[PDB]
From TrEMBL:
It is found in: Cell outer membrane. Belongs to the TonB-dependent receptor family. This is Ferric-mycobactin receptor, FemA. The keyword Transport applies. The chain holds residues 135 to 804 of 804 of the full protein. It comes from Pseudomonas aeruginosa (strain ATCC 15692 / DSM 22644 / CIP 104116 / JCM 14847 / LMG 12228 / 1C / PRS 101 / PAO1). GO terms for molecular function: siderophore uptake transmembrane transporter activity; sigma factor activity; signaling receptor activity. GO terms for cellular component: cell outer membrane; cytosol. The keyword Membrane applies. One of its GO terms (biological process) is regulation of iron ion transport. A motif (TonB C-terminal box) lies at residues 653-670. It is a multi-pass membrane protein. Keywords: Cell outer membrane, Ion transport, Iron, Iron transport, Membrane, Receptor, Signal, TonB box, Transmembrane, Transmembrane beta strand, Transport.
Length: 670
């Protein structure tokens, strides 16, 4: 079925399938895309708390910007940015915590590489690099009464309860609750963090009727907020990264960020070859912050911290309804889906940038003045209203005993947004557009264990508004249509799988031309190769490895200083290697190592500002034992074991590494 949880692959660290938006779940070997799905077991073994913790440690395609000391994580995938706000939830946008998705309630975290507008519609944030999808935990038949306690340097103490029960005839009903409370000093100087999280996953499985409800509350409170380093007009070189414990932004920064959501989902089998489905959900997101971005001034590490207060009240609704069925026109099977989706959001987002305070990269900042930001006090006005709605039709044509599979789709995507000035309430912009966006794929299975494939699909982003500097200040540009071609090969030898893919993604870029009109006449052309190996090649020895190579060409810019140069914040080379080993010499003892590599990259489109490659090494240990009939597992995670300090490049800015960080936990099942 479309919604059946894909089984775990050999080794239990990844799964055998993942969601393809409106098409539902597909096995890796029947997906004409590059998909990876990480399991709860991998989450729990690595003591990963966020999407970022997980993807950075394991995935060769994903690299994190911001990091855990910052209020936000973003992701780069196939040399494009992917916003945390663009992470899906069972294939739906707008329902997960806006700045940073927690994963201690997740059964899977999945990554579909490359744009996928046909499959899911436009992402709220306009991301086209790839779609990250979280699958919520459900209650298993066996009852779960799990408690764990944890410690993370320097003094964060936590507790996590995971309780599940199924009930009724044939265990038709499921209830799974997760609660976390984690609090205390982080690894970084003068920083502390509080984190409460509550989730519930509720399901009913009947004969023809399948229902679920997911609820989530979370809050992230920071005392001390790490922020990026911006390049300044005459930066000529990027200083060497400081000790990752140093905190060189605003000493008395804070964040309070709260997200909560609910989504209800259903299917009903109207006949043996016809199923209706729908989902309705929404999200409230409350944001309060004072912090500062650090700006490079000169070239020996001096900075200026540019202070801001930001307050946000964000209210999102997200829904889908559709039909899927199947028929035969002779030797050909049709598996068709007709879907319609809607995201509606009202946001108030106010800010004021006041304060410029001198600091240094190599120094943890002292207490400094907090400007008077009381002009943002009171109720937060509406600053934006957005409505994204689409209708799609797809058909997977299966031929020759399902060994050839041709998928075609088209979607009509509507976009509408209105903006209002934060001070005056004046209507500033109103964008209303539509785009038709198709896909086509083919997959052939020469062997049971070998799949070859090609796809074409697009990605959409809402057009930018012209900066106030420009001749066309305020004017909203047309949507950016990204286009992907990909081919690849997947080979499953039973215990492990190797994949290869080649892609290209072309996308318009906007810039201010030499006559001060902001135009989307730029083109980026990202072409790359991806290689992966995963599974359990020997008994008790699990491996996840991979490497990418990408040429992220700014193939059209006008400006000769940048033309045909590399897009900033996009390393050409990346790789990961992870090994998890059950020691045959001690019962219950498993040892993990990981190596993460990121090649050199640039911060600027002229490519005068390069930042070096980097390496991180992680070490883990888990020890499973019994006490009084009950299973316990003690774990250790050592992230960045070598204590390396490194910049991650982005476009016009960089984010500092986290320090060497030890986590310990004990888990008990009752
Ligand atoms: C009492 C405060 C709670 C902190 C949890 C500590 C977890 C102890 O586990 C240690 C396991 O280390 C060895 C792993 O192998
Ligand atoms: C059959 C398992 C159902 C378990 C649900 C328990 C819900 C606990 O609610 C959390 C309230 O905690 C207070 C936070 O303040
Ligand atoms: C737009 C408002 C919709 C938000 C409703 C979300 C409800 C979240 O409930 C989470 C509760 O979890 C603890 C049980
Ligand atoms: C099974 C299909 C729909 C089930 C009923 C949905 C009830 C609404 O759930 C909460 C959504 O809140 C939206 C707030 O915006
Ligand atoms: K899934
Ligand atoms: K890995
Ligand atoms: K970012
Ligand atoms: K998308
Ligand atoms: K959008
Ligand atoms: K957004
Ligand atoms: K824990
Ligand atoms: K706005
Ligand atoms: K590069």
């Amino acid at each position: 079925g479309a919604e059946t949880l894909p089984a775990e692959y050999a080794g239990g660290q990844v799964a055998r399938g993942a969601r393809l938006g409106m098409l539902g779940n597909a096995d890796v070997m029947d997906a004409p895309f590059s998909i990876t799905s990480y399991t709860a077991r991998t989450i729990e073994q690595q003591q990963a708390r966020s999407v970022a913790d997980l993807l950075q440690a394991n995935d060769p395609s994903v690299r994190v910007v911001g990091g855990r000391g910052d209020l936000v994580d973003s992701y780069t995938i196939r040399g494009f940015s992917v916003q945390n706000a663009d992470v899906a939830f069972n294939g739906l946008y707008g329902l997960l915590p806006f700045w940073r998705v927690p994963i201690e309630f997740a059964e899977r975290v999945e990554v579909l590489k490359g744009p996928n507008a046909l499959l899911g519609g436009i992402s709220p944030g306009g991301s086209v690099g790839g779609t990250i999808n979280l699958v919520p935990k459900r209650a298993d038949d066996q009852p779960l009464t799990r408690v764990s306690v944890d410690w993370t340097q320097r003094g964060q103490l936590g507790t996590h309860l995971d309780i599940g029960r199924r009930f009724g005839e044939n265990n038709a009903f499921g209830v799974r609750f997760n609660g976390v409370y984690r609090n205390g000093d982080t690894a970084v100087d003068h920083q502390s963090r509080e984190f409460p999280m509550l989730s519930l996953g509720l399901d009913f499985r009947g004969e023809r009727l399948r229902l679920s409800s997911d609820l989530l509350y979370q809050k992230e409170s920071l005392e001390g907020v790490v922020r990026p380093l911006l390049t300044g007009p005459g930066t000529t070189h990027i200083p060497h990264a400081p000790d990752s414990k140093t905190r060189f932004g605003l000493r008395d920064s804070y964040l309070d960020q709260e997200d909560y959501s609910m989504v209800n989902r259903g299917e009903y089998d109207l006949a043996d070859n016809l199923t209706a489905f729908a989902s309705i959900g929404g999200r409230q997101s409350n944001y309060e912050t004072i912090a500062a971005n650090s700006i490079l001034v000169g070239n020996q590490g001096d900075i200026v911290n540019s202070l801001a207060r930001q307050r946000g009240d964000r209210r999102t609704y997200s829904a889908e309804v559709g039909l899927r069925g199947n028929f035969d026109t002779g030797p050909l099977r049709h598996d068709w889906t007709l879907s319609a989706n809607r995201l509606h959001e009202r946001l108030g987002m106010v800010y004021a940038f006041t304060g410029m305070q001198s600091g240094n990269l190599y120094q943890t900042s002292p207490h400094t003045p907090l400007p008077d930001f009381s002009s943002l006090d009171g109720s937060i006005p509406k600053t934006n209203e957005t409505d994204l709605g689409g209708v799609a039709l797809a058909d997977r044509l299966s031929f020759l005993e399902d060994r050839v599979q041709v998928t075609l789709g088209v979607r009509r995507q509507q976009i509408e947004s209105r903006n209002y000035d934060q001070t005056s309430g004046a209507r500033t912009s109103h964008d209303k557009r539509h785009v038709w966006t198709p896909m086509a794929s083919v997959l052939v299975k020469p062997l049971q264990d070998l799949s070859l494939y090609a796809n074409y699909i697009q990605g959409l982003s809402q057009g930018e508004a012209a900066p106030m500097t420009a001749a066309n200040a305020g004017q909203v540009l047309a949507p950016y249509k990204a286009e992907q071609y990909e081919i690849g090969a997947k080979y499953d030898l039973g215990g492990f799988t190797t994949t290869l893919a080649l892609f290209e993604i072309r996308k318009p870029n906007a810039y201010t031309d030499a006559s001060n009109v902001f135009r989307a006449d730029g083109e980026q052309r990202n072409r790359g190769v991806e290689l992966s190996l995963y599974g359990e090649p020997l008994d008790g020895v699990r491996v996840m490895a991979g490497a990418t190579y990408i040429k992220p060409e700014q193939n059209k810019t006008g400006d000769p200083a940048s033309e045909g140069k590399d897009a900033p914040g996009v390393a050409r080379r990346q790789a990961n290697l992870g090994v998890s080993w059950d020691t045959p010499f001690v019962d219950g003892l498993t040892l993990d190592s990981r190596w993460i590599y990121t090649g050199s990259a640039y911060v600027d489109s002229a490519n005068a500002l390069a930042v070096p490659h980097w390496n991180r090494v992680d070490l883990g240990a888990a020890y499973a034992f019994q006490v009084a009939g009950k299973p316990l597992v003690a774990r250790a995670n050592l992230e960045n074991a070598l204590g390396k300090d490194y910049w991650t490049a982005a476009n016009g800015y960089l984010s500092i590494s986290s320090p060497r960080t030890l986590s310990l936990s004990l888990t008990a099942d009752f």
